């Protein structure tokens, strides 16, 4: 009965549906009746062309604002270089209109789509906070294809107002269920960047999304880290197809690329999922992504099976999003229990790093207390350390179930002598594991240089629950 879209470029949207199974399985969700109706997505970027032929029918002024100029109208600033095309391309991936003879279709082609014009100017902490906290009882899902510089040297995250916006959003947004923040994991692959040095992607309040090429490979721009949750298709080499979306000046493009394209596709899939169950909390959504994402046919050299039998990669998280499986699992989903937080101060004295440091600690994860965790969600190793050349460090964290998370890989361009100041390295790779037992932190000098430094604080922060486990995969 379901008739797929007839838009002229829909046949070029290989990542939405194909016979090849190299797709996001979105048509299967459409055929179950989920196309985004009633869900509101906002693109936090350089503006949205609200009169675009393939966006106008879905555009939502209530999902939109211009923070750069402080007015309601997020229209991009037109320039000769077309610099401000980026948000319009992201918007079409989410919610381009279907069956209208124009371009292709959004993942959630009946969702309402808005944009916050906030990148076209100085992006201050207050700018980010006003964008992340925009209309949080109207907007369901925020999509951000931007972040700190991908030079492979920067360690940067949200400052106070932005961090407050994340916490207010997941606590009080969406009627108390929590705003959904979707983040692009980054374009710093060529610089050997790590998305754990990015506090937006590294945050537990964002779903950080990585990219795969059409042929199932790790793209040149991809950043590996333990905080990534899942993956959607994006661009690769010039023999691989790219992303089809709305472009500036009312055009259609078939050459949208990079990490920027992956987050909007995830945001669309999450919109379909919210339509299938509007009562999902922000943590529910991350559970669904973990349980339904698909490693198969994604190539990586670091696939590992965690303690509950799920395959996980630092390039891909739990793998490709599967929209059909998301909306199917969402329908009868039982809300997860309230989030518990167990804070474990590991060190009794500072430790010289030297060539290599290993810190072992057996934990009870708040046994006997209301924050006892037997089912891990996110885990953080909040580290304070000094070191003479930060990019020579590699840091690994091993869970009691034996899951080795790379918190930090070598960054050849990171010459900083600033160390880390209570930086909350995050891993998703031990999701649903029991965190009781021996944790191991490994810090090593990956260069031949005589480096030196001291680890002065290691707080292991565990989030999760104590009920509801599934039989391991």
């Amino acid at each position: 009965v379901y008739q797929e879209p007839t838009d002229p470029k829909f046949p070029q949207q290989w990542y939405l549906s194909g016979v090849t199974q190299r797709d996001l399985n979105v048509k299967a969700a459409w055929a179950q009746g989920y196309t985004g109706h009633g869900i509101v997505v906002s693109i936090l970027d350089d503006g949205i062309e609200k009169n675009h032929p393939d966006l106008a029918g879905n555009y939502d002024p209530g999902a939109s604002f211009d923070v750069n100029d402080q007015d309601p109208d997020p229209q991009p600033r037109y320039t000769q270089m077309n610099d401000n095309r980026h948000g319009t391309r992201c918007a079409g991936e989410v919610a381009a209109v279907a069956n209208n003879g124009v371009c292709g279709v959004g993942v959630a082609y009946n969702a309402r789509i808005g944009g916050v014009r906030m990148l076209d100017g100085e992006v201050t902490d207050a700018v980010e906070a006003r964008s992340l906290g925009l209309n949080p009882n109207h907007i369901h899902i925020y999509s951000a294809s931007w972040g700190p510089e991908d030079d492979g040297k920067t360690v940067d995250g949200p400052a106070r107002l932005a961090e407050e916006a994340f916490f207010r959003g997941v606590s009080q947004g969406r009627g108390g269920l929590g705003s959904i923040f979707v983040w692009a994991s980054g374009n710093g692959g060529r610089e050997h960047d790590s998305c754990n040095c990015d506090g937006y992607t590294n945050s537990i309040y964002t779903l950080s999304i990585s990219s795969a090429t059409q042929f199932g490979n790790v793209p040149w721009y991809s950043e590996a880290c333990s905080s990534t949750l899942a993956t959607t298709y994006s661009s690769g080499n010039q023999n691989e197809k790219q992303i089809v979306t709305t472009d500036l000046r009312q055009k259609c493009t078939e050459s949208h690329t990079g990490t920027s394209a992956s987050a909007p596709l995830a945001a669309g899939i999450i919109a379909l999922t919210l339509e299938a169950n509007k009562n999902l909390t922000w943590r529910d959504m991350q559970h669904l992504v973990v349980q339904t994402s698909k490693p198969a046919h994604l190539n990586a050299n670091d696939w590992a099976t965690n303690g509950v039998g799920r395959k996980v990669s630092h390039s891909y998280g739990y793998g490709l999003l599967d929209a059909g499986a998301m909306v199917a699992l969402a329908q009868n989903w039982t809300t997860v229990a309230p989030q518990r937080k167990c804070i474990i101060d590991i060190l009794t004295e500072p430790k010289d790093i030297g060539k290599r440091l290993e810190v072992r600690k057996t934990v009870t994860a708040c046994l006997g207390e209301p924050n006892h965790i037997t089912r891990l969600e996110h885990a953080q190793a909040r580290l304070t350390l000094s070191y003479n050349r930060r990019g020579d460090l590699a840091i690994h964290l091993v869970s009691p179930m034996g899951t080795r998370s790379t918190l930090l890989a070598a960054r050849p361009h990171d010459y900083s002598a600033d160390g880390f100041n209570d930086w909350a390295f995050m891993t998703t790779h031990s999701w649903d594991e029991d965190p009781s037992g021996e944790w191991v932190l490994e810090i090593e000098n990956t260069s031949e240089a005589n480096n030196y430094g001291t680890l002065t604080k290691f707080t292991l922060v565990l989030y999760g629950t104590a009920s509801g486990s599934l039989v391991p995969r």
């Binding site: 992006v123 972040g147 700190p148 940067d156």
Partner: peptide, 4 residues
């Protein structure tokens, strides 16, 4: 900072 912040980059697209």
């Amino acid at each position: 900072x912040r980059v697209r």
